[model samples]
Target: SSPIPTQFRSLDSAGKIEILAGRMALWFEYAPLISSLYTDGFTPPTIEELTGISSIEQNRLIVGAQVRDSILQSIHEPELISAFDTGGAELLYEIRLLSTTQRVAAATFIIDRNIDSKGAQDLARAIKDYPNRRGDVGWLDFDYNLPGDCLSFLYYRQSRENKNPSDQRTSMLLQALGVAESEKAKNRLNTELYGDKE
Candidate 1:
């Protein structure tokens, strides 16, 4: 029930089609126009009927372009921006779920490593999943190193916000189990799980 934004208010149906057709070949570039049309009272089925672009492709294009626009708007890093100047729709799409801050971090890491879309997928998943953990174990450390650590901060925040513990050591033990990275941490977990001290 929200109205169209003012920029799109001037576009009539034929005018919309005319603009779409003019740059149909560079579909990615014009994906935002389709989104604008949708907000300006056009439906996917209606657009497909006239433009011969499928609703499936319409949605994909729209979201990918939106992700790109978001990254562009948020990041001004020269090398990162230059590296992602073209043909990055799928790569950007993989990280679209991240916060604007996370996207910048992930994108910088992505460019540094020349990581593929699959790797990009993994990075985003880890980063997103990290925030969902309990306890503030790694809150101060977002290593952003490909091996993880980059995946640490998100988990730290989530532990505190979404998952709470009955006591500190309980979550501390759980944190040890969560990473399985150190023997000392594991000993702490076993002591907490099996030992009773008074």
Candidate 2:
């Protein structure tokens, strides 16, 4: 029923996007279109050669779209879903590391906070990896349920990468306390800061 055409050459990008905003959007679907091409043998090398996108780009497109589509079930608002439609394939790709409900949490968190691609990636990575270090230093002070704390923990972890024993301890304390930092730190400090956790 979707009119994306059955072949690659006859298809184009702008028309797809235009159709999306013109209200033909299936979440302004982009990934599945590419998937269809691949399913029909339009392999990464083939699409890359023709479309000027690398295989990495296609991989993001596939997994990104898959992640984006998978998130729709828990996310009911039309507004929230549309954010992914416009958030670009790369942004969608960043959330790929998150599980289903985690995707919803990060999705809403990203949309509300305007977190860019790098931040989104690190945040997602933080959430995914946070569970592993439960008994490590500074772990008890953070809240995994709160996105901001996860991000703060990410920055806290990054501080240890400097490798200077002198400043390392200093940086660790600074980073540990940074869980209290951010613009949202001022906005409804109790709501998000204290966390939405039950």
Candidate 3:
């Protein structure tokens, strides 16, 4: 009745962790979507009214926190944890955000090997600040939206890449919001989250 999604793979524990980290990074990249969703036209009453309990803002914060935590956990191997100071970690943190999924995951394992105590401490400090910095940019402005869009765009444009989790749902949402450009957002979302069958 339904077609199988091409992106679903049964990864071992390590693979699962890698996927989780990548997914979280992708989510962070889409932070602008949150802002766009709210600022474009459908500003929730809660946000518009500045209600104390802003679910939208709360969700943004939650997502940001999750992404930062994923980065931290990904990088925090025994060898890497003690390497850098807080400021140093913040400066070098971008290196952790790799372009490819495999590279992002592999970086963790790699860093764990070559990382010194100072480097690790710097990384940890950077992780500590990541969430705060992530939230500074409207929580849903270009910073978030562009990355997610970029990732989706790149994956789909590659031709060899198939759909993945988090693709279709994001596409549908963006389309509904009037921002659908590439099929990557939707296709990959379907592949990743819905297993392409839904």
Candidate 4:
């Protein structure tokens, strides 16, 4: 899944950096877990493996280590600390699911939502409330409903008046996740009618 959207115009540079910092913190916390499951082994893949390291060539090694260390050290910052907690919650919820693919997908999907620090903390608590929520459902059965169910819950929470949900943004988010219309049909119709005229 894409990393958290960083296009919030309302955020100043400092706020943007802080949010990205939080995201990096979460990535460090759970990326290792996901990699371990994928490779069926321990020792999380290096930063280059997680993200294709760029070809600055010489600076690659130093820069990667510097960024990694900075993110790790920043995990103690309030924003990043919340991100760490949220990551843990995501891991717990996802790890319980039987499908490894589903586990990873769901975790990334949640993180990609770009939930704020308080929202992350709240989501962690909400997720914990669902430990027994999957009772008696087989893996295959659970998989079928996972997408819709998770999406609905996230939307519902965001819709709550007191919850500071991003009403306009949620639509874009759902569309990205394939839960909402992509408007391909509408676009095609418009093109056919206009015959390439803008």
Which candidate has the top score in TM-score?
A: 2
Per-residue lDDT over 20-63 for candidate 4, one digit per residue giving the tens place of the 0 to 100 score = 33444444332332323323332223333434322232132222
Error of 3 at 68 (Å): 1.2
Cα-based lDDT for every prediction: 0.61, 0.63, 0.36, 0.35
The candidate scoring highest on lDDT is 2
Give the TM-scores of the predictions, in the order they appear. 0.55, 0.66, 0.20, 0.22
Q: Any residue pairs clashing in model 4, and if so which? A: none
lDDT for model 3 comes to 0.36
Q: Write the per-residue lDDT of candidate 2 for residues 1-198, one digit (tens) a residue.
A: 122434323555544333422434333254455665665655767666665557787677667777766776565566877776664567778988777888877777888878789878877888898889887656666677776677776666665566644466446545445544444432333432235452
The alpha-carbon lDDT assigned to residue 72 of candidate 4 equals 40
Ranking by lDDT: 2, 1, 3, 4
**CA lDDT, candidate 3, residue 63:** 40
lDDT of 1 by residue, 1-198 (tens): 122335545877676677666643344556767877887789999888888768877776676666666667885676676665465666777887888777877877777767788877877887777655434454333443332343433333344454333465456445435543334434544554457652
Model 1 earns a TM-score of 0.55
Using lDDT as the yardstick, the better of models 1 and 3 is 1
Model 3, 30-97: lDDT tens digits are 23333334444545454424433255543543343333445455644544333322222332333334
lDDT for model 4 comes to: 0.35
How well does candidate 3 match the true structure in TM-score terms? 0.20
